[PDB]
Amino acid sequence: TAQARDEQYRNFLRSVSLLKNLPEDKLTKIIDCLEVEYYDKGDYIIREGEEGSTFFILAKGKVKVTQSTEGHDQPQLIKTLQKGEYFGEKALISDDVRSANIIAEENDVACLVIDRETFNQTVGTFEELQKYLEGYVANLNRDDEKRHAK
Numbered sequence: 157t158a159q160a161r162d163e164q165y166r167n168f169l170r171s172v173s174l175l176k177n178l179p180e181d182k183l184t185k186i187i188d189c190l191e192v193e194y195y196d197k198g199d200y201i202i203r204e205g206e207e208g209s210t211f212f213i214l215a216k217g218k219v220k221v222t223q224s225t226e227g228h229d230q231p232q233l234i235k236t237l238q239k240g241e242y243f244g245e246k247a248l249i250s251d252d253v254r255s256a257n258i259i260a261e262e263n264d265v266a267c268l269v270i271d272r273e274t275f276n277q278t279v280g281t282f283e284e285l286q287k288y289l290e291g292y293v294a295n296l297n298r299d300d301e302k303r304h305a306k
């Protein structure tokens with residue numbers, strides 16, 4: 157049922173920190189425009205250095221965050237993320253290429269894929285959320301500098 161589907165997505169999206177206080181009409185816009193992409197173990201959802209403008213919410217499974225850093229020939233493992241966490245906002249906020257890899261850690265990982273326009277018309281319309289994400293990205297920049305990210 158369309159209604160049952162939309163209710164399931166509404167309940168999930170309201171469990172995401174960043175989205176919990178969105179007006180109904182903006183949550184409905186996300187519900188209407190999100191897409192789902194599925195990944196197998198080891199797949200790169202995001203690859204450092206590539207262009208990208210999608211915002212992702214992890215809906216099922218776990219992902220690894222890895223990043224190239226000075227003194228290491230392979231990207232180093234920074235953290236892992238789980239259901240309800242999000243990623244890919246930094247390319248939009250920093251106006252940059254992707255700055256880390258996001259790798260599926262297991263099979264049947266599912267992410268919600270939110271394009272730039274949808275992001276801009278929902279999350280990006282609320283100054284409190286923009287300022288929050290600006291501060292979060294600033295902390296990511298601090299972390300990048302402290303580990304000597306390439």
Ligand SMILES: Nc1nc2c(nc(Br)n2[C@@H]2O[C@@H]3COP(=O)(O)O[C@H]3[C@H]2O)c(=O)[nH]1
Pocket residue numbers: 202208221234235237242243244245246247248253254255256257258296297299300
């Ligand atoms: N640069 C950077 N990015 C991090 C970090 N942790 C995460 Br989650 N991320 C996420 O990894 C994504 C890679 O694509 P992005 O640069 O668009 O956004 C990044 C962030 O959402 C981090 O320490 N540094």
Ligand SMILES: [Ca+2]
Pocket residue numbers: 235236237238
């Ligand atoms: Ca974690």
Ligand SMILES: [Ca+2]
Pocket residue numbers: 280281282283286
């Ligand atoms: Ca604004």
Ligand SMILES: [Ca+2]
Pocket residue numbers: 295
């Ligand atoms: Ca921190």
Ligand SMILES: [Ca+2]
Pocket residue numbers: 255300305
């Ligand atoms: Ca950087």
Ligand code: NA
Pocket residue numbers: 193200201202
């Ligand atoms: Na992808």
